[PDB]
Amino acid sequence: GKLPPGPTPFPIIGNILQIDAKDISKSLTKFSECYGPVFTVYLGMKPTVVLHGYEAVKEALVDLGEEFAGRGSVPILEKVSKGLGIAFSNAKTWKEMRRFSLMTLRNFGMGKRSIEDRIQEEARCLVEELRKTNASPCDPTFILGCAPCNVICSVIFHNRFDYKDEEFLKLMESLHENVELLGTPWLQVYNNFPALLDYFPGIHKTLLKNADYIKNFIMEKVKEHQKLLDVNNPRDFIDCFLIKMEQENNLEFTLESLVIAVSDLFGAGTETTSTTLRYSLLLLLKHPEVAARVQEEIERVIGRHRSPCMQDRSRMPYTDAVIHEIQRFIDLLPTNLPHAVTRDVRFRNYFIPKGTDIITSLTSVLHDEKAFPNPKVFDPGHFLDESGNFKKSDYFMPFSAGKRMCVGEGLARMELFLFLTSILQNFKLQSLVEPKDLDITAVVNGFVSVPPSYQLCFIPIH
Ligand code: HEM
Numbered sequence: 001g002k003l004p005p006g007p008t009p010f011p012i013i014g015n016i017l018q019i020d021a022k023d024i025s026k027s028l029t030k031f032s033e034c035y036g037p038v039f040t041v042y043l044g045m046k047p048t049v050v051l052h053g054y055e056a057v058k059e060a061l062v063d064l065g066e067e068f069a070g071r072g073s074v075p076i077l078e079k080v081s082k083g084l085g086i087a088f089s090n091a092k093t094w095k096e097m098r099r100f101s102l103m104t105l106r107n108f109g110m111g112k113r114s115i116e117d118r119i120q121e122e123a124r125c126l127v128e129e130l131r132k133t134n135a136s137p138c139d140p141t142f143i144l145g146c147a148p149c150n151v152i153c154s155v156i157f158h159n160r161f162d163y164k165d166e167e168f169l170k171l172m173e174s175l176h177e178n179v180e181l182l183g184t185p186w187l188q189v190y191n192n193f194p195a196l197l198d199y200f201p202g203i204h205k206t207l208l209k210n211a212d213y214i215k216n217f218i219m220e221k222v223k224e225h226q227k228l229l230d231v232n233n234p235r236d237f238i239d240c241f242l243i244k245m246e247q248e249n250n251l252e253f254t255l256e257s258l259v260i261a262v263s264d265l266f267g268a269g270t271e272t273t274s275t276t277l278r279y280s281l282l283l284l285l286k287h288p289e290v291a292a293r294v295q296e297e298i299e300r301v302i303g304r305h306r307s308p309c310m311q312d313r314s315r316m317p318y319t320d321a322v323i324h325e326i327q328r329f330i331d332l333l334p335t336n337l338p339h340a341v342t343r344d345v346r347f348r349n350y351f352i353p354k355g356t357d358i359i360t361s362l363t364s365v366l367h368d369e370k371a372f373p374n375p376k377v378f379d380p381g382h383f384l385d386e387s388g389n390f391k392k393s394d395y396f397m398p399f400s401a402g403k404r405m406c407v408g409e410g411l412a413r414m415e416l417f418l419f420l421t422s423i424l425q426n427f428k429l430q431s432l433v434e435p436k437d438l439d440i441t442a443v444v445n446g447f448v449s450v451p452p453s454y455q456l457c458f459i460p461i462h
Pocket residue numbers: 086087088098152264265266268269270272273276332333336337338398399400401403404405406407408409411412
């Protein structure tokens with residue numbers, strides 16, 4: 001049946017001159033207007049079928065789930081991850097790592113001390129670190145990145161760290177630097193451009209270094225976890241993992257397999273959560289009435305005394321619509337993470353051969369013009385009915401959908417709820433600039449939309 005149409009394949013180096021590296025998503029849309037929902041693009045002689053719009057995206061990711069459940073190959077990760085872990089693994093190895101991870105990352109999947117409990121504990125430490133800024137102007141980047149990294153640590157090693165902890169610092173930096181240096185609009189760039197490896201050998205050297213620091217950091221906590229292991233009472237990810245390695249015969253589960261899975265979790269759950277939080281505060285600065293209506297709902301449903309908790313979310317339709325609207329507005333991963341077909345598939349009246357790269361435009365869904373009238377305008381009303389009640393949307397897909405859908409989806413959502421309610425409970429946000437002169441436009445560095453730099457003061461309220 002042949003591959004889908006698209007910007008006529010220029011011999012050798014594909015469509016680079018036709019793409020805007022600064023906003024690749026904007027180009028996929030400029031192409032959908034002229035070729036429809038499903039089209040093909042070239043980076044080299046390697047094709048990439050783009051799925052644009054909810055219909056094409058849901059059909060592929062959902063209805064044709066296992067057919068698209070593959071991950072595109074990346075040389076730098078193939079070296080570091082060795083085809084293991086969760087994010088870039090495939091088939092058997094992936095199937096097993098993902099299911100174990102979904103089972104272990106449930107709110108009450110690692111003992112009596114739940115995930116919510118670990119998040120609440122962290123949200124308390126967060127408020128303190130903000131209070132230590134003495135209400136003086138500051139850039140929240142550093143501390144809004146410490147909190148999510150700590151949530152992950154407690155979930156994995158059953159232990160959090162101090163923001164002044166030397167080791168923890170090197171780790172956050174290593175995790176940031178690696179996403180910052182690897183940051184590119186399309187991840188397949190690396191596999192479609194080998195000469196890039198010869199022009200800049202140092203890039204990969206730094207990546208491997210950080211990757212190995214991250215590995216050793218994780219490996220150390222693992223060796224000492226083995227000694228204190230209680231087979232009947234697993235307190236974290238490692239513990240459950242170390243137990244799966246015993247009386248259960250699985251060669252897929254080894255110490256190395258664990259280290260790589262934990263790196264993936266850190267890598268996938270730190271920067272994304274952090275950036276969303278940074279972007280959250282910024283949007284609350286840009287739209288202070290929203291920040292005030294959240295504070296109103298917080299005072300009314302939680303009060304000024306106790307720490308917020310997940311039960312509150314159901315009773316806080318407005319705050320929830322705010323969190324949904326932030327995730328939807330920022331479009332954290334415009335083009336999702338790259339997929340690939342696992343078998344030859346007939347996508348409608350097209351033919352897609354096993355291994356072909358796939359790219360789903362989440363921006364097309366999240367910003368659907370009909371599902372969200374005025375999709376480029378930030379408005380909590382998108383997730384609120386006429387009675388002020390929370391209103392779900394099939395188009396709310398910031399975490400993707402299908403067999404590959406984010407695995408830390410619950411843990412991230414709990415983080416955004418607890419952290420944002422706790423901050424607006426104890427603080428008022430003050431900007432040096434007035435709202436109309438504040439830039440909120442995203443600069444898509446890599447596969448992650450990052451918010452412009454900014455400072456503010458956290459004014460304690462009591
Ligand atoms: C606001 C925060 C987050 C957002 C917006 C986000 C979103 C996403 C998206 C869009 C994907 C790709 C899905 C696909 O392949 O189609 C993804 C995958 C994944 N995320 Fe997240 N994520 C966030 C946080 C987390 C957290 C906190 C963790 C871990 C504790 C995590 C773990 C991962 C992993 C491991 C995958 C790969 C799953 C697989 O390939 O089967 N994420 N996430």
